[PDB]
């Protein structure tokens, strides 16, 4: 008999993962209000406290303007429905600028430099309803069945 | 500057509790299918296996016929929504004869020896539509926010 | 985070004012303090006793 050797390639990214070490900025003085937030989906700010300084955030819905994207953190997150989320009434990391991998619902590759359209549930999708000011950063990969896309976020 | 002493009384009932040590019979060769069963509610038999011998039980629904009452067990039950229940695909303890405490939706004391009428979710009700042959044993107690009644069961 | 004043399972007693229009009511103060101590002794059926005010 003759011996053999094999080769395998790792996946590129995971949902809610910082794409690279470019000039980024996070917010950690935010608190989730009335619900839960999926890791890798956009969030909206409902109220900012006048004197205390905290910011109440929740999942994005129709007729609202996005503020940021949640990111992965092994310490501050909880496991539910075989995924990673931020439970209600807790701190949350919200990336307000930089490149990030986020969940998508589209079916084809996007155009580099084009504007980002979001769906009512906060995941990126072509021909969506909500209009933002973020861009695509040129990233298109799938991880074991989940569709991911790379987004450039600018501060509001 | 004098001493004092106080008195408190124990509650006397719990959902799905065996009332006393009279002649009783327990079917333990059953299995719950299609959902979960609350401790202290009536159950129905979907089908019985011809060769293996296991019975298949589920919660009482509209137009069906009750078969028994689920009873308490510190080992076979799962603690969920702050109560004892029987999850799907697990062994269950149905009780087919004797006196048992059952959950009730009535508001007045029943008459001893009358016929027991169940509501469409397997809980006793004074004006239910599902009719049985089981009788009332006389007991009528109230735990914290929970109404319990003594029902005597005989074999179907 | 719930404050000690906002817990929904601590005993609450509505009280008449100890000072009204710049006069004192030590009798009412004494009665209300004694009532609170008796309440704490009673609700726990002698298991616990008040120590601090």
């Amino acid at each position: 008999q003759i011996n053999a050797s094999y080769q395998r390639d790792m996946a590129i990214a995971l949902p809610g993962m910082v794409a690279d070490t470019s000039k980024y900025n996070i917010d950690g003085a935010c608190v989730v209000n009335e619900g839960d937030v999926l890791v890798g989906a956009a969030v909206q700010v409902v109220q900012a406290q006048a004197v205390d300084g905290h910011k109440l955030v929740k999942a994005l819905t129709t007729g609202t303007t996005p503020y940021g994207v949640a990111i992965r953190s092994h310490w501050q997150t909880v496991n539910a429905q075989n995924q990673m989320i931020y439970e209600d009434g807790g701190a949350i990391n919200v990336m307000t600028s930089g490149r990030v991998w986020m969940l998508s619902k589209s079916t084809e590759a996007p155009t580099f430099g084009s504007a980002v359209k979001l769906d009512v549930d906060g995941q990126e999708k072509s021909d969506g309803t909500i209009e933002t000011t973020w861009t695509y950063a040129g990233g298109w990969t799938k991880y074991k069945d989940i569709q991911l896309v790379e987004v450039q976020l600018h501060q509001l | 500057q004098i001493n004092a002493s106080y008195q408190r009384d124990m509650a006397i009932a719990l959902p799905g509790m065996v009332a006393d040590t009279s002649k009783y019979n327990i079917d333990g060769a059953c299995v719950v299918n299609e959902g979960d069963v609350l401790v202290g509610a009536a159950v129905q038999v979907v089908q019985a296996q011809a060769v293996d011998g296991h019975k298949l039980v589920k919660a009482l629904t509209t137009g069906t016929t009750p078969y028994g009452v689920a009873i308490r067990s510190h080992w076979q039950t799962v603690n969920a929504q702050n109560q004892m229940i029987y999850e799907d695909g697990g062994a269950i303890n149905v009780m087919t004869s004797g006196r048992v405490w059952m959950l009730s939706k009535s508001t007045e004391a029943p008459t001893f020896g009358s016929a027991v009428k169940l509501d469409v979710d397997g809980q006793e009700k004074s004006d239910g539509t599902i009719e049985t042959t089981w009788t009332y044993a006389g007991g009528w107690t109230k735990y914290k926010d929970i109404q319990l009644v003594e029902v005597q069961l005989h074999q179907l | 985070i719930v404050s000690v004043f906002n817990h929904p399972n601590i005993t609450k007693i509505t009280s008449g004012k100890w000072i009204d229009a710049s006069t004192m009511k030590p009798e009412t103060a004494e009665a209300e303090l004694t009532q609170a101590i008796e309440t704490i002794e009673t609700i726990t059926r002698g298991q616990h006793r008040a120590t601090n005010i």
């Binding site: 092994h74 995924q83 990673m84 | 009384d9 | -």
Partner: peptide, 27 residues
């Protein structure tokens, strides 16, 4: 799929070493 963290929710948890029992005076 399943994308979770390294440490399960039980590894980061505390159990108090004292229990509380209700009192029912005899009389």
């Amino acid at each position: 799929a399943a994308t979770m963290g390294i440490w399960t929710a039980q590894e980061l948890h505390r159990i108090k070493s004292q229990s509380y029992e209700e009192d029912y005076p005899v009389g």
